[model samples]
Target: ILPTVGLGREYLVLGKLLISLSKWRAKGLIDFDVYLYEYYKGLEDKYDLTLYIRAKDSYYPLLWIDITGSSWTEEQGESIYAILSVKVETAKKYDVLGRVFFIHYNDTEDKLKCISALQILNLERQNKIKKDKSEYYLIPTSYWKNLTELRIALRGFYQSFKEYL
Candidate 1:
């Protein structure tokens, strides 16, 4: 049963549907441009569905999901729901300064599901849906942030040292 409201129920439905989508994608049954938009009021209109995940602490055993798919209804001045193709990469990094990537999603049955890629892996594992296939990948937010910081630091160092060379 699809949910009309509640983030908890929304998480459940999204999780279930994501697993199914992964399986179908693996089997070539799912369209490469498969879309999943709306499903709620604050989300973007007619956007694709892709799973983005990372750890909350990166060191701790906690994980989190990104809120890249949706936007505020007041800001957009509209509401919608649809199934469409995923336009962007499935995995992405969380912003360091803004900390805008991760989000919270709960489930009524499970309760307090943190919404992580690893958790989704567990869901796939539990359901026996493409367990061995590489249809999905996990991208940690810290990894991206760390790399970005390194690049910025390296560029600064290079620019300063270039005058001597």
Candidate 2:
């Protein structure tokens, strides 16, 4: 069964907006991560979820999920590099490595954004009625084009953070 919270078509519909910082490549991971960390951290109400990835590493890994669509501010551009300093400092404090996962629906300029919770609940039915991509797609390969699997991926990165919120 699903958590009967305010589930609806529109709220769930927000799962599709974003101002891709992907062009920044590896750097966007920290930029967006801190942005969202500070973004939601200072909000009035909360709708995000977090988990420990449970793996070995120089540091522990964190997983964040925030699907509520928010806007993108172009002015946030100049702050790109500054974000890293904040992230590094934050990491020195938290002692962990992490990222957030969700449908990439950030309005960044204007609007919209799973519950990995849903992933665990449906141990029965078609399973994972509760659901959730983007740990892929950062490369151009020489492999054959079997695209179905490639189509399935989400975006992320967070933990160390900045002060945007």
Candidate 3:
């Protein structure tokens, strides 16, 4: 039988590499939706995956993933936590801190799946990723006693992301 993709040290090792690469690879906005209705109508691979995902082109802005009013209920929150745990664990195997950071938001109050990507890199690029629209942190949290462990896991994540790009 084939090994599960969610198990073993190899998964963790690869996940870490992937996560680290995501620092510069993954792209998204925080606090609000960014739909370039006018600028990106007839373009091809013009804005990169970050912007191309939001193209509307024809008449109005295209809607890819709703970020407004998006939130996690008890179950969804738990699920997200679980995903994060697995993602982080997978990243650890590759010796990378792939958990660079991420955004969290919704397009509407009822939408629980449209979470935005948090800004943690303080990128100088056109779109800057910020947490709660602040310069504090991406996976923004007040208490941070497990910084050491988190850091180690992140190391693995970094490696996983590097494999792709």
Candidate 4:
């Protein structure tokens, strides 16, 4: 069999795609479950060697960082922030880390905030196990190098979608 380095590259690309699509889902521009299906499909391609050998799998919720404008109502922002914060934190403990952040511009005042997530499936679901099982991959490894990138990417998406809201 060939090396899985190629599969690694493909996984990296798919990770980015999942992030992008989940962001869209957060903004209400796409269906939430549809995005999940696409993410699931992306993993299916790597199932045989990578995911199937994982010891545990779980569902993770998306993170929400509030980057709204100064003019925005504190009550609204805090309320939104609190809700997502709770959800994201809960998911993180289970090895699931997805993020959704908001950016507000006083000039644009775009009311764009959304939710998205990624999940790992269990071997129980697939009915298989490995002699040397490993941890299942979730968020992109590149994301950890610059955790703030999640906020930047999300804010960029919110600002771009400002035209709609």
How much lDDT does candidate 3 score? 0.27
Tell me the alpha-carbon RMSD of every candidate.
19.2, 19.0, 17.6, 20.2
Tell me how far the alpha carbon of residue 1 in candidate 2 is from the true structure, in angstroms, after superposition.
24
**lDDT (CA) per prediction:** 0.30, 0.27, 0.27, 0.32
- lDDT string, candidate 3, 1-165, tens digits: 576532333344334433433443344312222332353243323211222222133332222111111112422322221113322222234222233222222223311121211112222133432223212222322111222333333334334433523
- Residue 16: error of model 1 in Å? 0.7
Predicted candidate 2 versus true structure: per-residue lDDT over 43-157, tens digit per residue: 2222243433222232222444444222123223211100112222233344322232333222332222222222212221343121122111111111111211212222222
Counting clashing residue pairs in each candidate, in order, gives 9, 21, 53, 5
Work out the TM-score per prediction: 0.21, 0.22, 0.21, 0.21
Give the distance in Å from residue 20's predicted Cα in candidate 3 to where it truly belongs. Answer: 19
Best by TM-score: 2
lDDT of 4 by residue, 4-35 (tens): 64444334444554565566658875432321
* Model 2 lDDT, full chain set: 0.27
Worst 10 residues of 2 by lDDT: 134-143
TM-score for predicted model 1 compared with the true structure: 0.21
**Segments in model 2 whose C-alpha atoms lie over 4 Å from true places:** 1-10, 13-47, 52-62, 73-92, 100-103, 106-165
Give the higher-lDDT candidate: 3 or 4. Answer: 4
